[PDB]
Structure formats: C-alpha cells, structure tokens
Amino acid sequence: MRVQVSGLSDETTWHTLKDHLRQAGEVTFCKVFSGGRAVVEFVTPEDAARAITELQASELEGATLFLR
C-alpha cells in the first residue's frame, strides 16, 4: 500500500498532500521528499486503489500530480 507521488509543487507539504489524498482515503504514512516526490501509505488497499485510479493528473497547489 505504499504509493509514490510525483510532480508536486515545491511549496507542498504533507499537510496539503494528505488533505488532497484524503478524497480517496485516509493516510497512515506521508513523507515529502525533495524534487516534488512523496511516499504515502493508505489505511487499506481499497484506499490505495481509489487513489491510483481517481487522482491521476489531479491538481494540487497549481501542480499536476501523478501516483505510482
């Protein structure tokens, strides 16, 4: 259930990323890296599956986000 996030704004923090992802499901782990990357773990596989299907190319703080 670890999902990789890419394309994030330099400004984006785990607070704004977790809030965005919560549309798909709750988050138990969230680490924001440099270069617009993050690693996230959802509570359930269902949450991860919805995130990876429903939030591709979604917009967050001006940036286009991708999940892997």
Residue numbers in the entry: 202 to 269
The authors write:
To determine how the TbRGG2 RRM domain binds RNA, we obtained the structure of the domain bound to a poly-uridine (U4) RNA. The structure was solved by molecular replacement and refined to final Rwork/Rfree values of 18.1%/22.9% to 1.95 Å resolution. Comparison of the RNA-bound RRM domains with that of the apo RRM structure shows no significant structural changes take place upon U4 RNA binding. The TbRGG2-RNA structure has a complex asymmetric unit. However, four similar TbRGG2 RNA complexes were revealed. In each of these complexes two RRMs combine to simultaneously contact one RNA using a unique binding mode distinct from that observed in other RRM–RNA complexes. In the TbRGG2-RNA complex, key RNA base stacking interactions are provided by Phe230 from β-strand 2 and Trp215 from the N-terminus of α-helix 1, from two RRM subunits. In this novel RRM-RNA interaction, binding by the two RRMs splays apart the U4 substrate, suggesting a mechanism by which the protein may mediate melting or stabilization of single stranded RNA U stretches. In the TbRGG2 RRM-U4 structure, the uridine O2 and N3 atoms are read by the backbone amide nitrogen and carbonyl oxygen of RRM residue Cys231. In addition to the RNA contacts from the Cys231 backbone and the side chains of Phe230 and Trp215, several basic residues either make contacts to the RNA phosphate backbone (Lys219) or are positioned to provide electrostatic contacts to the RNA, such as Lys230.
